[PDB]
Enzyme design. Sequence first.
Site, short mmCIF file in Angstrom:
data_model
loop_
_atom_site.label_atom_id
_atom_site.label_comp_id
_atom_site.label_asym_id
_atom_site.label_seq_id
_atom_site.Cartn_x
_atom_site.Cartn_y
_atom_site.Cartn_z
N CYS A 95 0.82 -1.22 0.00
CA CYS A 95 0.00 0.00 0.00
C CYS A 95 0.86 1.27 0.00
CB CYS A 95 -0.93 -0.03 1.20
SG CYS A 95 -1.85 1.48 1.36
N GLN A 113 -13.38 -0.68 2.32
CA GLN A 113 -13.77 -2.04 2.03
C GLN A 113 -14.25 -2.68 3.36
OE1 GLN A 113 -10.35 -3.21 -1.51
NE2 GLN A 113 -9.78 -2.82 0.65
N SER A 136 -8.22 -5.56 -2.75
CA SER A 136 -6.82 -5.15 -2.85
C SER A 136 -5.75 -6.23 -2.66
CB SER A 136 -6.59 -4.07 -1.84
OG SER A 136 -7.62 -3.14 -1.99
N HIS A 139 -4.29 -8.40 4.17
CA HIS A 139 -3.92 -7.34 5.06
C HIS A 139 -3.58 -7.91 6.45
CE1 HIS A 139 -6.07 -4.10 2.65
NE2 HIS A 139 -6.79 -5.13 2.27
O1 LIG Z 1 -2.63 0.40 -4.19
C1 LIG Z 1 -2.79 0.81 -3.03
O2 LIG Z 1 -2.04 1.68 -2.58
C2 LIG Z 1 -3.99 0.38 -2.19
N1 LIG Z 1 -4.09 0.59 -0.88
C3 LIG Z 1 -5.30 0.08 -0.51
C4 LIG Z 1 -5.91 0.13 0.72
C5 LIG Z 1 -6.87 -0.79 1.08
C6 LIG Z 1 -7.49 -0.63 2.32
C7 LIG Z 1 -7.18 0.44 3.17
C8 LIG Z 1 -6.23 1.38 2.80
C9 LIG Z 1 -5.62 1.23 1.55
N2 LIG Z 1 -5.94 -0.40 -1.56
C10 LIG Z 1 -5.15 -0.25 -2.61
C11 LIG Z 1 -5.61 -0.74 -4.01
O3 LIG Z 1 -4.99 -1.61 -4.63
N3 LIG Z 1 -6.77 -0.23 -4.49
C12 LIG Z 1 -7.60 0.75 -3.71
C13 LIG Z 1 -8.92 0.06 -3.28
O4 LIG Z 1 -8.92 -1.34 -3.79
C14 LIG Z 1 -8.71 -1.44 -5.27
C15 LIG Z 1 -7.39 -0.75 -5.73
#
Ligand SMILES: O=C(O)c1[nH]c(-c2ccccc2)nc1C(=O)N1CCOCC1
Length: 145
Positions: A95, A113, A136, A139
């Site tokens: 992330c 989410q 994503s 976690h």
């Molecule tokens: O690349 C990132 O930096 C990322 N970080 C997160 C994230 C997921 C949950 C809480 C905080 C951050 N999701 C992502 C991500 O893949 N996303 C954002 C949404 O999910 C779909 C695409």
Amino acid sequence: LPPGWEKAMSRSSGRVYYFNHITNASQWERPSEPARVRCSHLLVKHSQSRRPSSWRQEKITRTKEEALELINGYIQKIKSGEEDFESLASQFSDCSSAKARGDLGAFSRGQMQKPFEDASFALRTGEMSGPVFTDSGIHIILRTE
Ligand SMILES: O=C(O)c1[nH]c(-c2ccccc2)nc1C(=O)N1CCOCC1
């Protein structure tokens, strides 16, 4: 037992433990809701990840199963004390919040989410979750506040 926590017995050992189906936490001792909580997390993406790409790696190609071995390593090394959350999150999270030692600041319900959010609200302050899956990747959440 507080809600979410299922008593279980240990397969290998026969020490009766506890399992939270929300956080996926496992702990030995017996266990024992706010508008906002604060958590950091360590994300390990995979090939089926919504966005299979991070600062760490241009195309992510590891499989979900490999994602899970990585996380279990991290979870073990943290639990034993042999690294800390923030350190691992800094080196290894996919992330963009890696550079902030995983930390995401406070949020309330409705913002994340829903698996991350349900897992995030079920943790007490200070507790790390087990592997938590969202679109994503997987976690490790530590609720800080
Ligand atoms: O690349 C990132 O930096 C990322 N970080 C997160 C994230 C997921 C949950 C809480 C905080 C951050 N999701 C992502 C991500 O893949 N996303 C954002 C949404 O999910 C779909 C695409």
